[PDB]
Amino acid sequence: IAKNDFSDIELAAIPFNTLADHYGERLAREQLALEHESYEMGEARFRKMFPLITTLLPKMIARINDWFEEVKAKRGKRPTAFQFLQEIKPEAVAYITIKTTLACLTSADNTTVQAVASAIGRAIEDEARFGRIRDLEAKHFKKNVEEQLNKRVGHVYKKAFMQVVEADMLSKGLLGGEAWSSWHKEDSIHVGVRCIEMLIESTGMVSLHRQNAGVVGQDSETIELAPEYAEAIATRAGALAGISPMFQPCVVPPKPWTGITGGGYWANGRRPLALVRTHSKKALMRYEDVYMPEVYKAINIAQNTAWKINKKVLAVANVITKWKHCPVEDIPAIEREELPMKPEDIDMNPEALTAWKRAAAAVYRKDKARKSRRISLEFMLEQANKFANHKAIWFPYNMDWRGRVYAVSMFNPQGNDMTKGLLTLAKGKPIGKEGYYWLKIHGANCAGVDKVPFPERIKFIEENHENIMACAKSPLENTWWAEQDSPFCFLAFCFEYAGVQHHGLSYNCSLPLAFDGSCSGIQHFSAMLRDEVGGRAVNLLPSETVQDIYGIVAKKVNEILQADAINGTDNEVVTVTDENTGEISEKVKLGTKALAGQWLAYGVTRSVTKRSVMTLAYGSKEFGFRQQVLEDTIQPAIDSGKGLMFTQPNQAAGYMAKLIWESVSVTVVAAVEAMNWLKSAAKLLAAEVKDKKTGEILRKRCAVHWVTPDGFPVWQEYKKPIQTRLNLMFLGQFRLQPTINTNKDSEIDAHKQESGIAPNFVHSQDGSHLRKTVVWAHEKYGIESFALIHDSFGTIPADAANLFKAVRETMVDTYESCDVLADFYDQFADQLHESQLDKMPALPAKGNLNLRDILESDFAFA
DNA sequence: CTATAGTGAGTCGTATTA
DNA sequence: TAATACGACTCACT
């Protein structure tokens, strides 16, 4: 083990060396240096900036010292935060805070004092530990290594790219460990809050706002980025110049994963990562010695893909994102949106100061969103411009408790349009007729043209040749591209395309082209159940046309509407018929006849069913859609000015929720029958079997466990949090008493255990597919560069051909030799129940579909 | 999922510390 | 001595 076995001084030297031999000495330090930014800002690096940081940092740092004197100069008990914070270096505490606070303000929703406070403690603790070794480390790579200039060089602008290291040739000292916080959450939060409290004091960077003072289920306290400060981020250029996200890319290939922890990043002066993100330590220890060569292999392969900033697009982005009217109708506006005017009628409540509260609300709900979207954007731009020149960069990877693979860094290939467009693959190959083809297939997809057959997609592309060429030429003048669904990505396609018209198929392209799965989960359920009626619906089977589940699910809603418009119930009486005299209320019930018509008066298209149905693989049922249709279709309808046909809004949702559910239930009968078998399993596995008046524990509440095809075990165990509050005098102004979930966990939550299985299962299932797909597309075919995004697979135009069939292969290969459901039963059988037994099973029926049809399936990527 | 978390005041009793 | 900070509890809440 790295720990214990070695001494602080060694551990602080090992990473640098094992990283200097490879890649050179110049980068060796750049890698550690860069990583060290997660904890402290560099003296030289800072001073060199003579941006926002240049004012925050110094004032913040001074305030931490002032406080330390204040605390000591006083008799009696010392604030709990002190105890922990006093140990840590003020230059690190300040940076971690500022840095971390901002990153948290990127979330348009969870900016409650607890989320923020928690983040700070989680990182301030990472410096508390590791800080020593981190210091030694800085010292060590700051000094020049001895002799050999050929080894100290390394890089050299050649054509070959840095090669990853051999897991077998890795020093023990690099084998990480202990990647879990060890502080009681109370202490953690304690630290957090004070840091925050000090940020405010020294620099009014943020403010605390009381939200919904009174509501027992909504009340809260949140952090808001102070106005003047927010306006600088949107207005100035690079106000976040020296404020890089917690996790940044890499300048050298990521440390391979050999164990449960300590992979990806290199420095030992940091808090090691963790193969699997988990709710607890022990929970993560269940992977200590599992043995899943394929999982690690898939991961390690994924890390390797080299990326490079897309210089050109970075050039366009740096500009347009500062226009008082950007051509991209999505880039958050610069000028705040002014609140609605008041009808002057203050003393009237017909609906004035009744709904006006709502009117203003929305505007406020948006300003916050738009503000925090600006920060995320700015973070990306900063991160983009920061590595714009780097020949190449890499991304370390992680997994969620289900398996799904994720890029650790904030700015990563799994981001949004702009984020994606700013990136492209490091090395490419000559496009060739094969590539040029799909490069144009992607560009089509990049626009809202992906519901049609390939040939016809191609038409669209060539039919806009002059357009594509115009924009590529002068992007700031021919903004046609910025009017496309995936603007920055399309624009990224134009730069390449034109690049082919200027070099022929001998052109070397690296743009990552992706093939996204139609409707993951519904695909997977369909395969494991061989449902033909449903698989086709998604797209498993070949067709002349691209199937559109959300669309075939809509045509069915319509025919029921048509019929219920002709026939159907008749508007019912009131509540006086059920209870004569006393309740003239609900003077309306509305039958199916009226309700349907109201729907036929609105339209009911593919939109009205998209979300309502795609949340099927999330535990949604007929009751779920109710509150879904309402806010996603009717509410904003009324709220706009239309939808005046929904007289009794609450009832309309009820009618539609039914129709969608009744409609889907027949379309993908399988998925439904499978989700049910799983809900009916987690239930028994959860429930606490008890005897009548004896209460003896026949068998306790257990967790649902199963293993995925590529051999990745997964345990799903939702638990009930043990809460508590804290009494914190805030800025000596009032007592902030936040409710917080304590690390100590108790009884299992059978309700969430049940309603969470299905959605979790498939996701885990498509996670293994994504992995197998990386191993196959890497061994069978040359594909070595991957742009994974859960249900979207991408590579370079050259390798596109092979990846396109690779996904089909693995997809097929697995469900032909694996009965996941049965394999599941082989889990909770010999590991669950003792008495009942019956009234549970009934494995769903298998279908008449041929998993081979997939290979030839034209529009069923993934 | 990407972890997440009702609020402040009025009152007491307690170990701690200049 | 006698300040200090804060966990514990109980309440009322636009």
CSV table of N, CA, C and O (backbone and C1' of nucleotides) in Angstrom, one decimal, chain A residues 75-78 185 219 221 279 401 723 725 734-735 737 739 741, chain B residues 1-11 14-18:
chain,number,residue,atom,x,y,z
A,75,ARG,N,-11.6,34.5,25.6
A,75,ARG,CA,-11.7,33.4,26.5
A,75,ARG,C,-12.8,32.4,26.1
A,75,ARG,O,-13.4,32.6,25.1
A,76,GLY,N,-13.1,31.4,26.9
A,76,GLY,CA,-14.1,30.5,26.6
A,76,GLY,C,-14.0,29.7,25.4
A,76,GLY,O,-13.1,29.8,24.6
A,77,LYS,N,-15.0,28.8,25.2
A,77,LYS,CA,-15.2,28.0,24.0
A,77,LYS,C,-14.8,28.6,22.7
A,77,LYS,O,-15.1,29.8,22.5
A,78,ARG,N,-14.2,27.9,21.8
A,78,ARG,CA,-13.8,28.4,20.5
A,78,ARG,C,-14.7,27.8,19.5
A,78,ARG,O,-15.1,26.7,19.6
A,185,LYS,N,-20.4,15.1,9.2
A,185,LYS,CA,-21.0,16.1,8.4
A,185,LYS,C,-21.2,17.4,9.2
A,185,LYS,O,-21.1,18.5,8.6
A,219,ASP,N,-39.3,26.5,2.5
A,219,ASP,CA,-38.4,27.5,3.1
A,219,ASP,C,-37.0,27.1,3.0
A,219,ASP,O,-36.7,25.9,3.0
A,221,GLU,N,-32.5,28.9,2.7
A,221,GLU,CA,-31.6,30.0,2.7
A,221,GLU,C,-30.6,29.7,1.6
A,221,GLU,O,-29.9,28.7,1.6
A,279,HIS,N,-22.5,6.4,-2.0
A,279,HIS,CA,-23.1,7.1,-0.9
A,279,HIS,C,-22.3,6.9,0.4
A,279,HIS,O,-22.4,7.7,1.3
A,401,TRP,N,-22.9,4.8,-9.3
A,401,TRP,CA,-23.1,3.5,-8.7
A,401,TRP,C,-23.8,2.4,-9.6
A,401,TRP,O,-23.9,1.2,-9.3
A,723,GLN,N,-31.3,13.1,10.3
A,723,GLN,CA,-31.0,14.5,10.3
A,723,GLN,C,-30.7,15.1,11.6
A,723,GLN,O,-30.5,14.4,12.6
A,725,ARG,N,-29.9,19.6,13.2
A,725,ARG,CA,-29.7,21.0,12.8
A,725,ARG,C,-28.4,21.5,13.5
A,725,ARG,O,-27.8,20.7,14.3
A,734,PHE,N,-27.6,36.8,13.0
A,734,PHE,CA,-28.7,35.9,13.3
A,734,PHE,C,-28.2,34.5,13.4
A,734,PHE,O,-27.1,34.2,13.0
A,735,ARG,N,-29.0,33.6,14.0
A,735,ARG,CA,-28.6,32.2,14.1
A,735,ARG,C,-29.1,31.3,13.0
A,735,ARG,O,-30.2,30.9,13.0
A,737,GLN,N,-29.6,28.0,11.4
A,737,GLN,CA,-29.7,26.6,12.0
A,737,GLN,C,-30.2,25.7,10.8
A,737,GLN,O,-31.3,25.4,10.7
A,739,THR,N,-30.7,22.4,8.5
A,739,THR,CA,-31.0,21.0,8.6
A,739,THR,C,-30.0,20.2,7.7
A,739,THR,O,-29.8,20.7,6.6
A,741,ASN,N,-28.2,16.2,6.6
A,741,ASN,CA,-28.2,14.7,6.7
A,741,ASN,C,-26.9,14.3,7.3
A,741,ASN,O,-25.8,14.6,6.7
B,1,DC,O5',-30.7,8.0,-8.2
B,1,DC,C5',-29.8,9.2,-8.2
B,1,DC,C4',-28.5,9.0,-8.9
B,1,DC,C3',-27.5,10.1,-8.6
B,1,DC,O3',-26.1,9.6,-8.7
B,1,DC,C1',-28.2,10.4,-10.9
B,2,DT,P,-24.9,10.5,-8.1
B,2,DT,O5',-23.9,10.7,-9.4
B,2,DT,C5',-24.4,11.2,-10.6
B,2,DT,C4',-23.5,12.4,-11.0
B,2,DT,C3',-23.5,13.5,-9.9
B,2,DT,O3',-22.3,14.1,-9.7
B,2,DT,C1',-24.5,14.4,-11.9
B,3,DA,P,-21.6,14.0,-8.2
B,3,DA,O5',-22.8,14.5,-7.3
B,3,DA,C5',-23.3,13.7,-6.2
B,3,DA,C4',-24.8,13.8,-6.1
B,3,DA,C3',-25.3,15.0,-5.4
B,3,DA,O3',-26.7,15.4,-5.8
B,3,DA,C1',-25.7,13.2,-4.0
B,4,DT,P,-27.4,16.7,-5.2
B,4,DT,O5',-28.0,16.2,-3.8
B,4,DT,C5',-29.0,15.2,-3.8
B,4,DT,C4',-29.8,15.3,-2.5
B,4,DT,C3',-30.0,16.7,-2.1
B,4,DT,O3',-31.2,16.8,-1.3
B,4,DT,C1',-28.6,15.6,-0.6
B,5,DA,P,-31.9,18.2,-1.0
B,5,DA,O5',-31.8,18.2,0.6
B,5,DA,C5',-32.1,17.0,1.4
B,5,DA,C4',-32.1,17.3,2.8
B,5,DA,C3',-32.6,18.7,3.2
B,5,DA,O3',-33.2,18.6,4.5
B,5,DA,C1',-30.3,18.7,3.6
B,6,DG,P,-34.8,18.8,4.7
B,6,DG,O5',-34.9,20.3,5.0
B,6,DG,C5',-36.2,21.0,5.2
B,6,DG,C4',-36.0,22.5,5.1
B,6,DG,C3',-35.1,23.0,6.3
B,6,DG,O3',-34.4,24.2,5.9
B,6,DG,C1',-37.3,23.8,6.6
B,7,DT,P,-33.5,25.0,7.0
B,7,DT,O5',-34.6,26.2,7.4
B,7,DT,C5',-34.9,27.2,6.5
B,7,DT,C4',-35.1,28.5,7.2
B,7,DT,C3',-33.9,28.7,8.2
B,7,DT,O3',-33.6,30.0,8.4
B,7,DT,C1',-36.0,28.4,9.4
B,8,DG,P,-32.4,30.4,9.4
B,8,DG,O5',-33.0,31.2,10.6
B,8,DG,C5',-33.7,32.5,10.2
B,8,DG,C4',-34.3,33.1,11.4
B,8,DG,C3',-33.3,33.4,12.6
B,8,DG,O3',-33.6,34.6,13.3
B,8,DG,C1',-34.8,31.8,13.3
B,9,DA,P,-32.9,35.1,14.6
B,9,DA,O5',-33.9,34.7,15.7
B,9,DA,C5',-35.3,34.9,15.5
B,9,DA,C4',-36.1,34.9,16.8
B,9,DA,C3',-35.4,35.3,18.0
B,9,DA,O3',-36.3,35.8,18.9
B,9,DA,C1',-35.8,33.0,18.1
B,10,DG,P,-35.9,36.5,20.3
B,10,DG,O5',-36.2,35.4,21.4
B,10,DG,C5',-37.6,34.9,21.5
B,10,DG,C4',-37.8,34.0,22.7
B,10,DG,C3',-36.9,34.4,23.9
B,10,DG,O3',-37.7,34.0,25.1
B,10,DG,C1',-36.3,32.2,23.1
B,11,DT,P,-37.2,34.5,26.5
B,11,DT,O5',-36.8,33.1,27.3
B,11,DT,C5',-36.2,32.0,26.5
B,11,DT,C4',-36.0,30.9,27.4
B,11,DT,C3',-34.9,31.1,28.5
B,11,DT,O3',-35.2,30.3,29.6
B,11,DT,C1',-34.1,29.6,26.9
B,14,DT,P,-25.7,21.1,33.5
B,14,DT,O5',-24.4,21.1,32.6
B,14,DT,C5',-24.6,21.4,31.2
B,14,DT,C4',-23.4,21.0,30.4
B,14,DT,C3',-22.2,21.1,31.4
B,14,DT,O3',-21.2,20.1,30.9
B,14,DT,C1',-22.1,22.9,29.8
B,15,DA,P,-19.9,19.9,31.8
B,15,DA,O5',-18.6,20.2,30.9
B,15,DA,C5',-18.3,19.4,29.8
B,15,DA,C4',-17.5,20.1,28.8
B,15,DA,C3',-16.1,20.3,29.3
B,15,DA,O3',-15.2,20.2,28.3
B,15,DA,C1',-17.0,22.4,29.1
B,16,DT,P,-13.6,20.4,28.4
B,16,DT,O5',-13.4,22.0,28.1
B,16,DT,C5',-14.2,22.5,27.0
B,16,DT,C4',-13.7,23.8,26.5
B,16,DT,C3',-12.3,24.1,26.9
B,16,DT,O3',-11.7,25.0,25.9
B,16,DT,C1',-13.7,25.6,28.1
B,17,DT,P,-10.1,25.3,25.9
B,17,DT,O5',-10.0,26.8,26.5
B,17,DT,C5',-10.6,27.8,25.7
B,17,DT,C4',-10.2,29.2,26.3
B,17,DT,C3',-8.8,29.3,26.8
B,17,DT,O3',-8.4,30.6,26.7
B,17,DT,C1',-10.2,29.4,28.6
B,18,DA,P,-6.8,31.0,26.4
B,18,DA,O5',-6.8,32.6,26.6
B,18,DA,C5',-7.7,33.4,25.9
B,18,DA,C4',-8.0,34.7,26.6
B,18,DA,C3',-6.7,35.3,27.1
B,18,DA,O3',-6.7,36.7,27.1
B,18,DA,C1',-8.0,34.6,28.9
